[PDB]
Amino acid sequence: HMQYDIVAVTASAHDGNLPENTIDGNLSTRWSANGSGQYITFDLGSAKTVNQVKAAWYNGDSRTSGFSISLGSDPASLTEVYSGTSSGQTNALESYSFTATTARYIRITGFGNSSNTWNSITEVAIFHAGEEGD
Ligand SMILES: [Ca+2]
Numbered sequence: 001h002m003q004y005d006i007v008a009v010t011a012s013a014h015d016g017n018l019p020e021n022t023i024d025g026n027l028s029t030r031w032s033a034n035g036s037g038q039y040i041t042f043d044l045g046s047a048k049t050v051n052q053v054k055a056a057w058y059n060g061d062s063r064t065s066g067f068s069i070s071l072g073s074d075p076a077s078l079t080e081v082y083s084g085t086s087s088g089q090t091n092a093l094e095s096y097s098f099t100a101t102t103a104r105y106i107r108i109t110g111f112g113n114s115s116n117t118w119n120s121i122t123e124v125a126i127f128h129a130g131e132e133g134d
Contacts, residue, residue: 061090066084
């Protein structure tokens with residue numbers, strides 16, 4: 001099981017809740033950007049094998065967020081690997097798994113949530129996960 005270092009984070013926008021708040025280890029700090037289609041981009045610093053992205057959602061136990069995950073070797077050429085909606089059932093890191101593939105950049109695009117148009121993420125982690133489960 002490998003959790004990759006995130007050397008840099010950028011976003012399409014933020015409201016003062018900075019993109020770097022997603023990699024500070026603190027569920028009490030967040031990235032926020034208002035509107036469907038806002039996004040946050042993680043840099044691993046080099047190409048790695050990735051098969052899982054975890055995101056902890058702001059008010060994640062009270063509302064569902066629509067999102068898509070894309071990845072690739074450069075931000076101008078990303079491919080979608082995952083699309084869905086957060087569970088609405090936890091504030092913890094929630095795992096989004098997909099077929100293992102090479103990426104340096106991971107982008108989460110948000111489509112707002114079940115309460116309002118905000119995209120608010122408290123933590124992200126990027127993995128090469130092995131076999132896991134009860
Ligand atoms: Ca945080």
